[PDB]
């Protein structure tokens, strides 16, 4: 009944050697009732990826708002928005609603197209930026996610290795949370190509 708990949902992002990964679960619940098995929580504007947990209506509203804004950006600037810049756009957009916030835990993943360096960021619901360079977590199993990442993570992982770490981090966190799970998608983001995998997991 606390808005950040109604639908349930986890996002995690990790950096590795010349790559980033962002993963999310697929459940959309209404309290105990599992409602949808296909609710993805990761979006992408150009090469910039946004995962959003929390109230699902806000998740949808935010994606549509950032599509809208990055489109207008691309038209005026005649280039794709960069992760660092987008982070700033997320931050100030959320703070614009300081006193009636969107109940969400946004995560940004992407590689800088000019410098090639991997970039991740998290935010709280009013736009405060978490500037960790290893991993970012969010959602109703964030506790479990922090536990997994801090144990499993190591710097400079190769994309195929990073896929294992992020997937194992997500999967095992999901499985200690009643409200998250029911499917998982992982994005592996390499400057040049993006592979998206759907995971096999417990449907309970």
């Amino acid at each position: 009944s606390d808005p950040s708990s109604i639908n349930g949902g986890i996002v995690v992002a990790m950096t590795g050697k010349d790559c980033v990964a962002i993963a999310c679960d697929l459940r959309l619940g209404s309290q105990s009732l599992g409602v949808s098995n296909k609710f993805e929580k990761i979006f992408h504007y150009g090469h910039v990826f946004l995962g959003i947990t929390g109230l699902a209506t806000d998740v949808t509203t935010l994606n549509e708002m950032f599509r809208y804004k990055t489109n207008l950006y691309k038209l005026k600037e005649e280039r794709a928005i960069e992760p660092e810049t987008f982070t700033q756009l997320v931050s100030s957009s959320l703070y614009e609603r300081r006193f009636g916030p969107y109940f969400v835990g946004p995560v940004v993943a992407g590689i800088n197209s000019k410098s090639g360096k991997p970039f991740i960021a998290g935010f709280d619901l009013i736009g405060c930026i978490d500037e960790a360079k290893d991993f970012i977590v969010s959602g109703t199993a964030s506790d479990q996610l922090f536990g997994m990442c801090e144990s499993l993570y190591e710097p400079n992982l190769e994309p195929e290795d990073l896929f294992e770490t992020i997937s194992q981090a997500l999967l095992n966190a999901a499985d200690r949370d009643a409200l998250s799970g029911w499917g998982a998608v992982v994005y592996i983001i390499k400057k040049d190509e993006v592979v998206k995998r759907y995971l096999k997991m417990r449907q309970d």
Binding site: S30, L33, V35, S36, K38, F39, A56, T57, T60, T61
Partner: protein, 198 residues
């Protein structure tokens, strides 16, 4: 509590809505139609708070109808549902939000697919093979998880609902006075007006 069910088969979408309207200690009507036609190929069903329910539906209907006449063209189920979602999403943060849950069932003539959208009063939208609002979902979801197949005929879809209604008439505390059933397909919206004494 108000039963609003939707099931999407292969060539059509089927909506079933309860017929009771109950204020307090009395059932005031046993034949209420909890549905508005949005376009020749788009039907919306609704449950929720006493006043808001019909005002919202009609407000949506007038807007879609207006759009239709302005462009001499029928918006897709997907486009209609996004409109409906955005309306609810604005509403949730206004002074007095509409407390209305909806199912939108339509046939997309361009894609030749049937489409079912579940949207709650908060503006949470999802496409589903089958859907429900309120307490009824706590029974029907698992029943359809079992018996539902993606490639069913309309006639098979109507048997799946007969099962859903039966189950709700057995285990729900309240007498919802049967359901009105409507099919949305490539031809449009018709009423299977003989479902209760069937």
């Amino acid at each position: 509590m108000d039963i609003i069910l939707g099931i999407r088969v292969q060539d059509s979408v089927i909506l079933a809505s309860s017929k009771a309207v109950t204020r307090g200690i009395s059932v005031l009507k046993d034949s209420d139609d909890k549905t508005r036609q949005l376009s020749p190929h788009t039907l919306m069903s609704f449950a929720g708070e006493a006043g808001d329910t019909v005002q919202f539906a009609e407000y949506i209907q007038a807007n879609i109808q207006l759009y239709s006449i302005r462009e001499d063209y029928e918006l897709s189920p997907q486009a209609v549902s996004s409109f409906v979602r955005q309306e609810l999403a604005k509403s949730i943060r206004s002074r007095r939000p509409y407390q209305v849950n909806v199912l939108i069932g339509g046939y997309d003539k361009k894609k030749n697919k049937p489409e079912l959208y579940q949207i709650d009063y908060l503006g949470t939208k999802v496409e589903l093979p089958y859907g429900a609002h309120g307490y009824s979902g706590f029974y029907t979801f698992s029943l359809l998880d079992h018996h539902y197949r993606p490639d069913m005929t309309t006639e098979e879809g109507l048997d799946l609902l007969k099962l859903c209604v039966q189950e709700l008439e057995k285990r729900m505390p309240m007498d919802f006075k049967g359901v009105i059933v409507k099919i949305v397909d490539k031809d449009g919206i018709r009423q299977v007006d003989d479902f209760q004494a069937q």
